[PDB]
Amino acid sequence: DILECDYFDTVDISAAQKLQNGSYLFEGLLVPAILTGEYDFRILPDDSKQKVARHIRGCVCKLKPCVRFCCPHDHIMDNGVCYDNMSDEELAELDPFLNVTLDDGSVSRRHFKNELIVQWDLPMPCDGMFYLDNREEQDKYTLFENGTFFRHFDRVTLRKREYCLQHLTFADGNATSIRIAPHNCLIV
């Protein structure tokens, strides 16, 4: 809907404050009125237009960096399935920082939820997704601020329709640690 704005770079702002000059106020962020737009649809993984309540959205990803997420912010991915059973302990043990490569080519550590904008209402990039584990040379990747997900194994670029990060439980051999891992489609 919204002018030259890709879907996945939008957010449900039906909860943001509506200013006088038409524009909106959202989580301290000021979404120019010209970038907002109403929507009766929400694109799918097969990528079509499924009906939805008339909710006003906001192309904010272009006014402040985003982080393509598969599920909300307290949810832990479990075999590609959104799980919401993270105990007070796990949450107190989850590396909240992702490494993102800025425009200038250098890498900066960024809080997943504070220095960025967590998008969670975006449709799954595909059913049955394979997560990644950079610890392994093959699973190496580069997630940019603009959201362009680049994979080093097969030098393939993914647009946010094609990927999403999420909290995922790993295995330190005989232990267990949670770090945000990307998830790619082995097919779509």
Spatial contact of 21 and 32, defined as CB atoms under 8 Å apart: no
Alpha-carbon distance 112 to 37, whole Å? Answer: 26
Among residues 14, 44, 63, the one where a domain terminates is 63
Sign of CA dihedral 76, 88, 115, 5: positive
Same domain, 74 and 57: no
The CATH number that applies at residue 141 is: 2.170.180.11
Same domain, 139 and 95: yes
Residues in the chain: 188
Show the tokens assigned to 55: 């909710």
Calculate the dihedral angle through the C-alpha atoms of 31, 36, 38, 41, rounding to the nearest 10 degrees. Answer: -100
SS (H, E, C) the chain: CCCCCCHHHCEECCCCEECCCCCEEECCEEECHHHEEEEEEEECCCCCEEEEEEEEEECHHHCCCEEEECCCCCCEEECCEEECCCCHHHHCCEECEEEEECCCCCEEEEECCCCCEEECCCCCCCCCCEECCCCCHHHCEEEECCCCEEECCCCEEECCCCEEEEEEECCCCCCCCEEEEEEECCCC
Alpha-carbon distance 59 to 37, whole Å? Answer: 8
Q: How was this structure determined?
A: X-ray
The structure was resolved to a resolution in Å of 3.5
Same domain, 120 and 44: no
Same domain, 121 and 187: yes
Same domain, 43 and 90: no
The CATH number that applies at residue 25 is: 2.30.160.11
Q: Tell me which residue of 47, 42, 19, 43 sits closest to 31, measured CA to CA.
A: 19
Show the tokens assigned to 123: 């449709």
Same domain, 44 and 126: no
Alpha-carbon distance 151 to 64, whole Å? Answer: 23
Alpha-carbon distance 9 to 59, whole Å? Answer: 6
- 186 Cβ partners below 8 Å, 6+ apart? 126, 128, 129, 130
- 51 Cβ partners below 8 Å, 6+ apart? 40, 41
Phi, psi of 27 (to 5 degrees): 50, 50
Same domain, 36 and 71: no
Same domain, 103 and 91: yes
Neighbours of 153 (CB within 10 A): 13
Q: Domain of 161?
A: 64-188
CA angle 56, 57, 63 (to 5 degrees): 140
Number of structural domains found in the chain = 2
